[PDB]
Design a protein around this ligand. Structure first.
Ligand SMILES: CC(C)C[C@H](NC(=O)[C@H](CN)NP(=O)(O)CNC(=O)OCc1ccccc1)C(=O)O
Ligand SMILES: [Ca+2]
Ligand SMILES: [Ca+2]
Ligand SMILES: [Ca+2]
Ligand SMILES: [Ca+2]
Ligand SMILES: [Zn+2]
Length: 316
């Protein structure tokens, strides 16, 4: 909408107060004009029609329980935009400052979030498996990263290419969580998953097997569930990325860690310069090796560590 840029205040899903960029024109709307061509947050009103209504508020204060998922979807989309711009010199998901749209209160008791080809969509959860999913910065960044992937490598959402697609979203979701630097970890979704159980998460990148996901190619899933295991076999790539950053010895193979920032540079370059819609795990290894070679040189430690990490997870 046309209006003037304003700054509201509210509370997110976890009860934390934050400022949000809004737009005033009769109402105060969740429209942040400070980033690209805007970040826009919508109310789906417990229905499944999308996007719903651009979120309107009478007083620019967003402290109601119903407001909390919208506050966090809007704010964490901003953080994710900042990460891609400041760290990778990428302007929004398309690289040309496309408007970022999110809808909250999608459906009833909906235990998921997704990118629908055009926008982000967040359920509220059923209150037992999940609380509203936009409360997780890693979840928000995971979703926006699907848009980045779709505009760049275009990895098809099935089998190995789809597991790479998922892992890319977990990797950058985690790197955005570290960028914001509030309780960062290598787990996915811990802030919104199972409010009655402490210490768990949807997936672990450091130990995928903790939640039944493979941590070696020899343990990959080859059935048809979950689009051929896209959220299962992502564990093999997530583990490789964790090893590249943090190091470790895994199935007897030692990896010298190079840190998060270099992990992000290597995988961002692989995603945007080398991967294709049909890339498999072996091709991802080659893309990561080439990306590290471009950035750091063929004789570098960074190249050596990429190779060790893919060796450790059985990907040649
Ligand atoms: C229990 C759940 C929460 C685990 C997991 N979901 C996730 O890990 C993440 C949230 N953390 N959501 P996503 O990967 O973006 C789901 N996207 C999707 O299925 O696209 C399918 C799709 C394709 C095209 C258009 C629209 C949708 C699952 O869905 O199995
Ligand atoms: Ca209000
Ligand atoms: Ca965390
Ligand atoms: Ca996390
Ligand atoms: Ca929990
Ligand atoms: Zn995903």
């Amino acid at each position: 909408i046309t209006g003037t840029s304003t700054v509201g205040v509210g509370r997110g899903v976890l009860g934390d107060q934050k400022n949000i960029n809004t737009t005033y024109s009769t109402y105060y709307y969740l429209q942040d004009n400070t980033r690209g061509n805007g970040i826009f947050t919508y109310d789906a009103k417990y229905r499944t029609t999308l996007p719903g209504s651009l979120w309107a508020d009478a007083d620019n204060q967003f402290f109601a329980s119903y407001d909390a998922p919208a506050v966090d979807a809007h704010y964490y989309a901003g953080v994710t935009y900042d990460y891609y711009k400041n760290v990778h010199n990428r302007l929004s998901y398309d690289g040309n400052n496309a408007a970022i749209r999110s809808s909250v209160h999608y459906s009833q008791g909906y235990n998921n979030a997704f990118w629908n080809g055009s926008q982000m969509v967040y359920g509220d959860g059923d209150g037992q498996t999940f609380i509203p999913l936009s409360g997780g910065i890693d979840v928000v960044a995971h979703e926006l990263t699907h848009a980045v992937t779709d505009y760049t490598a275009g990895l098809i959402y099935q089998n190995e290419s789809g597991a790479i697609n998922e892992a890319i979203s977990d990797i950058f979701g985690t790197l955005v969580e570290f960028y914001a630097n509030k309780n960062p970890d290598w787990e996915i979704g811990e802030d919104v998953y199972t409010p009655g159980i402490s210490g768990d998460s949807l997936r672990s990148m450091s130990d995928p097997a903790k939640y039944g996901d493979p941590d070696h190619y020899s343990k990959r899933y080859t059935g048809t569930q979950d689009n051929g295991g896209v959220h299962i076999n992502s564990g093999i790539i997530n583990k490789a990325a964790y090893l590249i950053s943090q190091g470790g010895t895994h199935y007897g193979v030692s990896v010298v860690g190079i840190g998060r920032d270099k992990l992000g540079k290597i995988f961002y370059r692989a995603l945007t310069q080398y991967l294709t819609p049909t890339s498999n795990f072996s091709q991802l290894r080659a893309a990561a090796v080439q990306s590290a070679t471009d950035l750091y040189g063929s004789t570098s430690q960074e190249v050596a560590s990429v190779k060790q990490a893919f060796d450790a997870v059985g990907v040649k």
